[PDB]
Design a protein around this ligand. Sequence first.
Ligand code: CL
Ligand code: CL
Ligand code: CL
Ligand code: CL
Ligand code: CL
Ligand code: CL
Ligand code: CU
Ligand code: CU
Ligand code: CU
Ligand code: CU
Ligand code: CU
Ligand code: CU
Ligand code: CU
Ligand code: CU
Ligand code: CU
Lengths: 276, 275, 275
Amino acid sequence: RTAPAGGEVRHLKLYIEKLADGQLGYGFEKGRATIPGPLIELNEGDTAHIEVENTLDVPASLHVHGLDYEITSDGTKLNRSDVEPGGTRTYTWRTHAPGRRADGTWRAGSAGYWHYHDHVVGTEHGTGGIRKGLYGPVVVRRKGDVLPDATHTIVFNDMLINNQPAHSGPNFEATVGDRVEFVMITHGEYYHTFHMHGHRWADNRTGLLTGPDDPSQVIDNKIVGPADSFGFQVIAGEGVGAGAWMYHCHVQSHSDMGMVGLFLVKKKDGTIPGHE
Amino acid sequence: RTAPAGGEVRHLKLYIEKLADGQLGYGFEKGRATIPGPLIELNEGDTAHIEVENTLDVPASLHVHGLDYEITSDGTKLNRSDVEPGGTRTYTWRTHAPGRRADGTWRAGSAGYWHYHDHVVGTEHGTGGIRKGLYGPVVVRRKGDVLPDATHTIVFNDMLINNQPAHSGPNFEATVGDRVEFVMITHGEYYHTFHMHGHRWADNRTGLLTGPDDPSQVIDNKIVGPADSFGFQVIAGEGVGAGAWMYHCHVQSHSDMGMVGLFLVKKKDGTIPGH
Amino acid sequence: RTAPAGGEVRHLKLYIEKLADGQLGYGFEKGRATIPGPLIELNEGDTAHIEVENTLDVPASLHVHGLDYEITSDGTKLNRSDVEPGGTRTYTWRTHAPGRRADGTWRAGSAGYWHYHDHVVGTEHGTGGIRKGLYGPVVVRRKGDVLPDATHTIVFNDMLINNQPAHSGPNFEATVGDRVEFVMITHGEYYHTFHMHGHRWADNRTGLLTGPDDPSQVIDNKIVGPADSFGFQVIAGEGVGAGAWMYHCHVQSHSDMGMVGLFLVKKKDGTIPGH
Ligand SMILES: [Cl-]
Ligand SMILES: [Cl-]
Ligand SMILES: [Cl-]
Ligand SMILES: [Cl-]
Ligand SMILES: [Cl-]
Ligand SMILES: [Cl-]
Ligand SMILES: [Cu+2]
Ligand SMILES: [Cu+2]
Ligand SMILES: [Cu+2]
Ligand SMILES: [Cu+2]
Ligand SMILES: [Cu+2]
Ligand SMILES: [Cu+2]
Ligand SMILES: [Cu+2]
Ligand SMILES: [Cu+2]
Ligand SMILES: [Cu+2]
């Protein structure tokens, strides 16, 4: 499939909750909060009204990367955009399509791989909040953008993936030939380098090449640092066939200390070449 | 407006001098130096002759990124390009437009977001000199490149912004609809992530999509290490509006430790919604 | 001169062996294996069968970036691709050209600057093998790609360039007007920024602008991290003349610690400006 034009206006509830293990999360539902928070997909031109209810005991906020929002939706202590504890506040994210300005210049669309995260917990930059798991993927499609069969989010949050314990995964699961979207986010103090076995992508907006004239580098290794966001797609097993395809931070310490996961690509039999 | 064709020759005089302690600037007039140094603005094809007088009591130099210079302008003790204390030397920067070679291959233009820094003070790679603030923005335009209303230079130097103490800014002030050009330069030991609230830019030469077919990633956040140089223009408050829009390093401790500042975008009447 | 279309089948023999002190390397020749390991060049579509012979007494393997390889050629302990001590094993790399997919999307080719390295020695991720010098360049070319006169590989491995001691270089040699290719691979714990004096390139697959309409920023400085891989081509001293043009890591304490070397560009004379 390809994505349609936007303009639709969505109403979402987002709850800021303490998880059973004392972590923090966004969720569409009271008690259902996940780390990472839920995926939010918009099409260019869409508008999202998110009413945030903060159940914590500390002021918490909602900040987004790359979408259009006014100073009142900033999510910051600075701009008085945060949510006092047991409070609720509606955030408004806006999105626009590429086009020409009055002078003739080209205006860049909102489309890309983005993320939302808390800006007020533990410090005025959300250091406490980010550490404890308040973050999530935001994806903005452009009219005509190829769409996946699945999206998977991997956040390198300091030394952990998705605030999972070391050597935890996650593993993701696909069958040969599915189109698989990967959204990569990074947080904390450290730089990483993201690697995937048996697959490669294009370093550009969509991780997909236009046609024969796209100069973009093809790479299976991309260095990243806190709050970077990118994504790409893959045809699973393309040319490499089924199996367990490792993905990991390539900083050698981080890898040995367990920032690793598995991309389990299955034969159409739903069978996988025998692994460890 | 837009950048015209280059080829004009320029003469400029740079002084290397101490200001406060732990700080050494470049400046166009004696006593007038700053951190960062003056912006040098060229069009592709222009030549820069820069007269440099070293008022420091140790050797200092001029070394530039991306522009053409011969070995004699290198800026290094290696190539004996340094400036003796109290002395003077004239550097040369050439610049060229893109074009076909004889073999028919494409030779790239000089244009881009570049910078100069001292290569000999405190070490042979200018460790001492860079730390104390000898660095500056160099911007070379391609004919047809858009010109900004204002240009602002944001340098991340180790843990400080433009060698300003934590939480001291700098702030940057514009008005909605202004085309504000930023040039971002990193120096020192550490990588960073430069981020800005409410705005975005292309990841490419000019930081501006050439049109609908530009594949470049649109981004509000970029990893950068020492000597990295990039630039872009935004329409101030475009799609977002008046407000005091943070920029900062996104490394968690970095932003908490005071690498923070404001792009302060006013209304047409001077209004910033209260903060 | 330009690369042709691929599709050949290749057979290459690689020896993992222990070098003079505690050091490990890949080699074509039994006994003279080098750090970094031998350059492997391919045209898009080339199929390469590589026999590996492991002369060490711990397991060891071969793992490549970007090329098509099946799970049995992974080079890992979990996918059961590691080579027992004394044993030999054949790894298959495969390559393909770009073209319209079944769904009419454009499938990316394999062309680019890649590397191989060890995924087994000392850890599941080969930290010890990589540290000890098991790593080396791969270059996959597209039909039409411009060929160089010479190819140099610079590897940043932790704090050492190509496993040489600090301040030992390597230095590379060229005549003005040479078309010189540099492959740059990074490994270890650290990030660097690769700087080159008097020479600039384009950030993209080949390092060279495909024409006037390639938006890619032009750079002399690029931040990199473990397993990152790129490469480019310059014309020796184009616009800047002969001389000794430093290259180095521009992380300031890394410069000082000796990640530094020379691009020595001679006149057709054979003469070089002094340094
Ligand atoms: Cl709705
Ligand atoms: Cl989700
Ligand atoms: Cl023009
Ligand atoms: Cl410090
Ligand atoms: Cl590091
Ligand atoms: Cl020289
Ligand atoms: Cu912020
Ligand atoms: Cu890591
Ligand atoms: Cu953020
Ligand atoms: Cu791996
Ligand atoms: Cu240098
Ligand atoms: Cu920082
Ligand atoms: Cu420099
Ligand atoms: Cu370094
Ligand atoms: Cu690798």
